[PDB]
Amino acid sequence: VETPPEVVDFMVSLAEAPRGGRVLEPACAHGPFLRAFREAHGTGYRFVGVEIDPKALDLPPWAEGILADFLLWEPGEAFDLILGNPPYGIVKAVKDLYKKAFSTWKGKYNLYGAFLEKAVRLLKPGGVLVFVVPATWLVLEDFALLREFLAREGKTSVYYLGEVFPQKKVSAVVIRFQKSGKGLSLWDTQESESGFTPILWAEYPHWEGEIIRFETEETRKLEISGMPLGDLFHIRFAARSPEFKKHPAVRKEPGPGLVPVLTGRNLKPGWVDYEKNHSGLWMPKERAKELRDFYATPHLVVAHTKGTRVVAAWDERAYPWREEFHLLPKEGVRLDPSTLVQWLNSEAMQKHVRTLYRDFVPHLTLRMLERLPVRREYGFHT
Ligand SMILES: Nc1ncnc2c1ncn2[C@@H]1O[C@H](CSCC[C@H](N)C(=O)O)[C@@H](O)[C@H]1O
């Protein structure tokens, strides 16, 4: 993803460093941030750039260039200011090595997470870092260890930019971090002719690494006046195609006594389309429970393939599914399906989920789902 000029401008104005202080740009190429900073803040600093590809390293005379893998680079020096746009993405052994090297590494992780941990470690006390990175780390669990690390190493400011790169499936966020432990500040941002204008949204001085959300008075009212979905239901996952394909009784052409294996396109807001087959697999309904027992019990289905919105339906016939979230009520819990469903698909529920998580991620996640508030008269534990 390329960095627009106005975004670079925005980051440079959040950047500060003492005269004579060292300024570094990891994964520099021709050094776009080194250049912009010098023009806006002056020449009285030491400029360094670290690039792994010698063909890409193209820095002006006043800057010092280092050919190396930033992630494995040990300068023996600490910096005052670190800024840049780290590569986004996942990558064995160079990886494995990394895993050993980085404590916040969890799951598949992402290179931008490693660059973050690395950058924070090369910072002098009180030093600052300004990076443009994806917004996924705010809600995903692979980044739970990263959030804690940041939470305890200094104060964090998160500025929401959104989908600002010409490539539209990535929502961006600018993080300004100073190595002087002191909570979290969430900022919104206004886009105009001049560039970006920040707007303080909320402050969390006691932040310990919890999920970051855009909360409002109304979202709070809604969450305290109900029970979270995750208290009333067990959230199960469906079996995948391989599991189905390895199952005798599973066919590939229709036939008598065979029902289609339902997918997300069969799920509509408020109802299920049992007609269309979108998987190309069929099997006798009664043998479904052999793959997952809950397949034999009529239950609630919420989608994860339809974006950041709540689409729910009650599977009254109990058919086999290849995806989506499957909710089975906990013991003692008695609910009214019809109204629970109406509630979940409501225009109130969509605005709630939209306000809090915006477009951080491309689809509803387990953590977002389990906190959805079930208004008292739809379901309760007896
Ligand atoms: N491990 C590493 N160490 C140092 N430089 C690296 C590096 N990995 C990539 N780079 C360099 O940093 C530049 C990529 S910049 C990343 C742009 C954008 N955020 C994206 O996701 O694509 C390239 O010039 C590359 O050579």
Q: Which domains does the chain have, with CATH numbers?
A: 1-212 (3.40.50.150), 213-381 (3.90.220.10)
Of 185, 174, 156, 135, give the one whose Cα is nearest residue 308. Answer: 135
Contact assessment for residue 146 and residue 116, using Cβ atoms and an 8 Å cutoff: yes
Of 21, 201, 38, 6, give the one whose Cα is nearest residue 124. Answer: 21
Known binding-site residue numbers = 3, 25-28, 51, 69, 87
Q: Which amino acid is at 28?
A: C
| CB-count exposure of residue 134 (10 Å: 0-12, 13-18, 19+) | buried
d(CA 372, CA 354): 12
Helix (H) / strand (E) element for 124: namely strand 123-134
Q: Which residues are catalytic?
A: 85-86, 88, 165
d(CA 63, CA 39): 13
Bridge pairing between strands 325-329 and 233-237: antiparallel
Break positions in the chain: residue before each gap, C to N over 2.5 angstroms: 91
Atom of ligand 1 nearest to the CA of 70: 3
d(CA 270, CA 181): 47
Contact assessment for residue 10 and residue 197, using Cβ atoms and an 8 Å cutoff: no
Look at the block and give the residue holding tokens 């975004």. 7
d(CA 69, CA 94): 10
What the block records as the tokens of 301 is 């289905």
What the block records as the tokens of 363 is 């689809």
Is 217 near ligand 1, meaning CB less than 6 Å away?
no
Known binding-site residue numbers for S-adenosyl-L-methionine = 3, 25-28, 51, 69, 87
What the block records as the tokens of 251 is 């066919």
For the chain, where are the alpha helices, taking DSSP H only? 5-12, 32-41, 94-101, 111-121, 144-153, 217-224, 229-232, 241-245, 337-344, 347-357, 366-369
Q: How far is the CA of 27 from the centre of ligand 1 (A)?
A: 5
Atom of ligand 1 nearest to the CA of 115: 1
Sign for the CA dihedral angle at 140, 145, 148, 149 comes to negative
Helix then strand then coil, % of the chain, to nearest 5: 30, 30, 45
Contact assessment for residue 308 and residue 357, using Cβ atoms and an 8 Å cutoff: yes
Write out the DSSP string of 86-104: PPPS----HHHHHHHH-TT
Q: Indicate which technique resolved this structure.
A: X-ray
Helix (H) / strand (E) element for 235: namely strand 233-237
Of 196, 200, 189, 176, give the one whose Cα is nearest residue 358. Answer: 189
Atom of ligand 1 nearest to the CA of 89: 21
What the block records as the tokens of 180 is 């002087």
Contacts of 172 (CB under 8 A, 6+ apart): 1, 7, 132, 133, 134, 135, 161, 162, 163, 164, 165
Phi, psi dihedrals of residue 212, rounded to the nearest 5°: -100, 130
Q: How far is the CA of 344 from the centre of ligand 1 (A)?
A: 43
Contact assessment for residue 302 and residue 311, using Cβ atoms and an 8 Å cutoff: yes
Q: In this structure, how many other beta carbons lie within 10 angstroms of the beta carbon of residue 264? A: 16
Is 52 near ligand 1, meaning CB less than 6 Å away?
yes
To one decimal place, what's the resolution in Å?
2.6
Is 85 near ligand 1, meaning CB less than 6 Å away?
yes
Look at the block and give the residue holding tokens 């599977």. 315
Angle at 309 between CA 307 and CA 311, to 5 degrees: 105
Look at the block and give the residue holding tokens 């300024």. 23
Is 172 near ligand 1, meaning CB less than 6 Å away?
no
The neighbouring-strand residues paired with 177 are: 129, 156
Is 211 near ligand 1, meaning CB less than 6 Å away?
no
Q: In this structure, how many other beta carbons lie within 10 angstroms of the beta carbon of residue 224? A: 7
CA separation, residue 184 to residues 146, 150, 187, 200 (Å): 14, 10, 10, 11
Look at the block and give the residue holding tokens 């002087």. 180
d(CA 205, CA 185): 8
What the block records as the tokens of 154 is 């200094």
Largest Cα separation within the chain, whole Å, is 81
How many angstroms from the chain centroid is the CA of residue 201? 19
What the block records as the tokens of 77 is 């020096």
What the block records as the tokens of 346 is 């409501």
Contact assessment for residue 281 and residue 241, using Cβ atoms and an 8 Å cutoff: yes
Q: Which amino acid is at 162?
A: G
Contact assessment for residue 162 and residue 201, using Cβ atoms and an 8 Å cutoff: no
Within a 13 Å sphere around the CA of 307, how many CA atoms are in the beta-carbon half?
Answer: 7
Sign for the CA dihedral angle at 11, 216, 112, 115 comes to positive
| CB-count exposure of residue 341 (10 Å: 0-12, 13-18, 19+) | buried
d(CA 212, CA 356): 9
Contact assessment for residue 189 and residue 161, using Cβ atoms and an 8 Å cutoff: yes
Is 73 near ligand 1, meaning CB less than 6 Å away?
no
Angle at 54 between CA 22 and CA 71, to 5 degrees: 55
